[PDB]
Amino acid sequence: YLSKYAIDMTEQARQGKLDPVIGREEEIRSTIRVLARRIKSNPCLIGEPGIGKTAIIEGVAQRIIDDDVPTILQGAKLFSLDLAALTAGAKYKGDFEERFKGVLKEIEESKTLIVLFIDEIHMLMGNGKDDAANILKPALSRGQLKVIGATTNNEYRSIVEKDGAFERRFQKIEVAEPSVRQTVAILRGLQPKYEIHHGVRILDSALVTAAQLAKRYLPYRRLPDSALDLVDISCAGVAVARDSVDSDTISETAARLTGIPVKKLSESENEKLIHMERDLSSEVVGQMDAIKAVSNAVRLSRSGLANPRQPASFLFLGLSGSGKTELAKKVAGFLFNDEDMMIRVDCSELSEKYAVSKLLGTTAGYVGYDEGGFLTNQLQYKPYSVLLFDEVEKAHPDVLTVMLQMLDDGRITSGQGKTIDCSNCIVIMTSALGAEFINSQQGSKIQESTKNLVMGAVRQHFRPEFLNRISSIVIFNKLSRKAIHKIVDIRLKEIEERFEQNDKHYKLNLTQEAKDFLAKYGYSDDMGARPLNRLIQNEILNKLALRILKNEIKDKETVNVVLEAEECLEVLPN
């Protein structure tokens, strides 16, 4: 067997239709340290899939065919003849190894000094630890020549990396995530031929952009692949458009994944974090301090002093006035524009300081399921979520402490091991029980004595590391009387859009006197604070239904109409 599943290349390097992309040369030089390397003749290279681990090996050939490098190994076999020949040898069983053995003689004793390479070590050895690919490999490898595979790390690879045939054999030397600046030098070097065969012409600055931005925000698809897409994405519009710019190639992409790039293309970071801050003021008023308290490590977030792995967040004081938990996540969204952030864990099951039920729960060693599948998964999902807490934590101090780990420091104690990060994750434990002392309010604001003390009563309540680090504060005077009121127009403008504003432009009117009557009643002293939404909607939504029933009128309206006496009964006519 000769050329069939093989990658005949060095020629395609020697004739050179290959397009050089020159990455990190070191591990190659490291790899070059193979040529006569013996004891363990080779390392490996472990990336995630998309990184050109072999494009390296391709670039290696560029390091090779171009010669003027060590000719200690000079004559060449680089070519990977596996493919699927594993099962794809013939019409029946047993020839897989033949399929390589049919390779063996047409690969017989080496004139050409160059070891070749097959893909993964798990493309190597077929399934792994199977006869496929001549499971035992001194005799050729210590023998005519060698080969190389490569993959991503641990488990499947680790198993055969412990002993098997690699007991004597290769290490792994792993290029990084494609780094910062070169990536345009990459990209711009990618430019000329790739961009020359892509379309039109081009200029720098945009090239910088998604580079940053794929690097940004884009752990999945971190690789230029998207730019490489953006590349084709680029010509996509215009070359078409010309058949009959601004990084706005990136825009619709950044529209695609973000939902608008004006979300992604957007407040840059830091001033704009502060602009974010003032836009969160724009969001919700109430204690500016609360805002400002929340504003604190905003700047410290992502900027770092000791680590970004610092958790930066604004420890919550459990209560719900307006933005409260909600906007706290909304801002947390309004950080990343992503509302979704993190869920809540019911701490009910968490009652003790231990259970099989924990945010980790199981270790994944033995039968069961993952408890707290969130950060199990939520990071598998997503970086930089909100968090989840309770005014009485019924949670296990275990994890709380195991998160006091992640609490004080940044990296969290991954139960299964893999603090994939704490980078942008900045969130604040939400607890307070002092409601009856929280009940201490007069006027629009509270002077602090109580707020020291139940604080104190809590300050020592659950032990200090909790209450030790992580400054910022959350304060509740609630709404005094009106100020919340503006929420209505929100509440209003929560309406029309949700489906289509088109449905009803009718936009009505709120007759503050009602909104008073609405609010004054409608939401408790304590809270009672949701329903008027859930409510006033209705009797109105009746008219909605109603005026949608027999249907004489269509307009954009202003309602502003109202009369136990507890009901003056708003309504609205045609």
Next chain:
Amino acid sequence: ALGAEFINSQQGSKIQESTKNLVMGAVRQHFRPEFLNRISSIVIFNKLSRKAIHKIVDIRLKEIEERFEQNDKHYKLNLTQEAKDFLAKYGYSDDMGARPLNRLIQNEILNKLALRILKNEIKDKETVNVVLEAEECLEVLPN
């Protein structure tokens, strides 16, 4: 080699005591007792040594001496202690066998020959000049 991993753990290049019997243990696998009576004996391929092989390797040229050049022109082969040692500690195997370096040994030969067929002064008596990827070497010839 079913037993050889007993000396994988470096054990008894000279076996004594019960190792052979522990060695004889894995025997029973492939074996059967009818097979027993009809079996003469049991004999190793040993672990050798440079103490052995450092001389053995020598033979390997006296081995290969007249291969290519039949009667044409012989050589001299000054080596001394480096060009005694070098290529042995270069290419021997403590795991594969006598196998590996042989083919290697073939290599450096013809390379110098490649040199010397590139050259052809180097008429009959030939000595060897060797000094210190891996395996830093020199291994040259005057001419």
Next chain:
Amino acid sequence: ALGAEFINSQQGSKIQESTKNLVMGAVRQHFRPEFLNRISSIVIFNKLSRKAIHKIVDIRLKEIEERFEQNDKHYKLNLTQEAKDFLAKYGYSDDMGARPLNRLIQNEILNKLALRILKNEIKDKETVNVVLEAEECLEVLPN
């Protein structure tokens, strides 16, 4: 033979009805009684001490080469007592014993021999004589 033959006894060929019993269940564990009832006879193997193996010697001495085409080398060997013992030293491996042991006892003694053939002084004659690592005894008798 599967059973408390495992213990055998530690006593002697009598062992005991115990083991003899121990087997019966150990028989009747898995097996089929009327089929077991198909057994005509209860037979067993015992502990043979010296005298047996002592004789097994006496047996083997002649015993092997006997049939051989030309024993015309007229092989008497010897004992006194001594010669019996040297293997009877090792004479019985509790596990394996003679048939394995003799197999080499066969060999080694036999191994000793084409020597005297090669020792090219005695040709057609025999006696054995020996004296005693602890090895030497081992045949080799001059003309």
